[PDB]
């Protein structure tokens, strides 16, 4: 027997409602509820969330990012690159009708879709040194335009790159200009990347176009044991030590023929 999706021990789970992990982390405008969330015991995501990447594309190394989250219990968002910091590029025009916010065109909240300015796109050379004591999850992206005219209008420079460097990362990315079928009315694509910036390390960004720059990153402030549970249920005012993807169960009897994936890891199962 079971009830629904409940709370675990004394810590309540993070329940993503129609939003995916990617939409949450990138700041999909349709997921504003998850700005400054508290500690969680485990994370809940639906099988097919409606709000994933408002602007279509891909999240690089997404499965290993999920495995990382299975050992993270709390984030603390911080601003590493203020949007007002961009003086040679336009930072307030990268909005799309694919990313609506209350009817108006918007974009992912934690990253900035930079645009040329004064008919020029000078080379960006920005570095952020993690002076904090915690590990830092940093997110950025690249824009793959649909055609060469779009590349010209947005970034001027026809041949562009993005360079990202840490003590462990040596990444150089070139955009792939190619015509595509439309997704969310968009024929371009946004590809996002992530890395952990260790304390006292520095991430060095360099680009002459197509750069979706970071503004907010996440401090890792607690490293317990979490899971990304796939469930359609909802909170769920209750409490247990063992939880399943289809309901909750208190006390203990080795009877269990429902699901292997269970937070709390209290016996048993077929």
């Amino acid at each position: 027997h079971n009830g629904k999706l409940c709370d675990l021990d004394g810590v309540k789970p993070l329940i993503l409602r129609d939003c995916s992990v990617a939409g949450w982390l990138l700041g999909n405008p349709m997921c504003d509820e998850f700005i400054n969330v508290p500690e969680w015991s485990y994370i809940v995501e639906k099988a097919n969330p409606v709000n994933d990447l408002c602007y279509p594309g891909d999240f690089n190394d997404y499965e290993e990012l999920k495995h990382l989250l299975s050992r993270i219990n709390h984030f603390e968002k911080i601003q590493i690159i203020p949007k007002s910091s961009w003086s040679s590029h336009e930072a307030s025009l990268g909005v799309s009708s694919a990313c609506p916010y209350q009817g108006k065109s918007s974009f992912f909240r934690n990253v900035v879709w930079l645009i040329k300015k004064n008919s020029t796109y000078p080379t960006i050379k920005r570095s952020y040194n993690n002076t904090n004591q915690e590990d830092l999850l940093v997110l950025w992206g690249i824009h793959h335009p649909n055609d060469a005219a779009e590349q010209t209008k947005l970034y001027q420079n026809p041949t562009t790159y993005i360079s990202v460097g840490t003590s462990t990362l040596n990444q150089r990315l070139v955009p792939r200009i190619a015509t595509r079928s439309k997704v969310n009315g968009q024929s371009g694509r946004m590809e996002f990347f992530w890395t952990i910036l260790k304390p006292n390390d520095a991430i060095n960004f360099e680009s002459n176009g197509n750069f979706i720059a970071p503004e907010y990153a996440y401090k890792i402030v607690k490293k317990g044991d979490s899971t990304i549970m796939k469930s359609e249920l909802e909170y769920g005012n209750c409490n247990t030590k063992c939880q399943t993807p289809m309901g909750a169960i208190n006390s203990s009897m080795p009877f269990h023929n429902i699901h292997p994936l269970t937070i709390g890891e209290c016996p048993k199962y077929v």
């Epitope: 025009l93 009708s97 040329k116 649909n146 055609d147 060469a148 005219a149 010209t152 015509t179």
Partner: antibody, heavy 123, light 108 residues
């Protein structure tokens, strides 16, 4: 709600220059590109170029690189086109127009046009 | 530069007829094409964008079709108010370019 108000007809001597204006109202002036177009009888429509007000981003049709100069005044919501070194072939109706989509979208169609400005170049 | 060719300089129609204006781009423009209507003494008006999307207020008897190089604007059930010039526009490449226009004249 969106209107484009163009300045009036002008008669110019050969070799002179003219500055025509386009006052936009009803929307965020800085979020849409302003197009400029040239229409002559017996000729197809010609694209002159493009300006995104407030950003300094300007595109010119190579055929008009020496003729046209764009500028935009965000406090006045007014876009300007200057035509220099006027010849007989510059006598035409000039339209300003707004792109229907916002600055970074891909559908560059002209949803709102001005009423046009007739330029006559003659001694 | 991409040349947009409207082979039909003129085109006749009775009220209620079905006419189609053709526009051939000299090279691929995908679906980055728009159609406009212009009556004498007036500024152009948007009809179609993205080859087949109807502009907001436009009646649904205006249909656009085609992709790549060959495009068509079809006016079904021609109405007296459709007396106008019609021209295409490609925005796949710089510079933007327009067709030379086709004049629709009503039969009588």
């Amino acid at each position: 709600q969106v209107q484009l108000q163009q300045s009036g007809a002008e008669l110019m001597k050969p070799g002179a220059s003219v500055k025509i204006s386009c006052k936009a109202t009803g929307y965020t002036f800085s979020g849409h590109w302003i197009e400029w177009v040239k229409q002559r009888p017996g000729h197809g429509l010609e694209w002159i170029g493009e300006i995104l007000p407030g950003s300094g981003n300007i595109h010119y049709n190579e055929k008009f690189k020496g003729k046209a100069t764009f500028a935009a005044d965000t406090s006045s919501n007014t876009a300007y086109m200057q035509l220099s070194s006027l010849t007989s072939e510059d006598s035409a109706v000039y339209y300003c127009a707004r792109l229907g989509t916002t600055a970074v979208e891909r559908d560059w169609y002209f949803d709102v046009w001005g009423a046009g400005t007739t330029v006559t170049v003659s001694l | 530069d991409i040349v947009m060719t409207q082979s039909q300089k003129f085109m006749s129609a009775s009220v209620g007829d079905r006419v189609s204006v053709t526009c051939k781009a000299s090279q691929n423009v995908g679906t980055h094409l728009a159609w406009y209507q212009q009556k004498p003494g007036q500024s152009p008006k948007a009809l179609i964008y993205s080859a087949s999307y109807r502009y907001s207020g436009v009646p649904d008897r205006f249909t656009g079709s085609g992709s790549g190089t060959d495009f068509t604007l079809t006016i079904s059930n021609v109405q007296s108010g459709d007396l106008a010039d019609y021209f295409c526009q490609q925005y796949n490449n710089f510079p933007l370019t327009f067709g030379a226009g086709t004049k629709l004249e009503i039969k009588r």
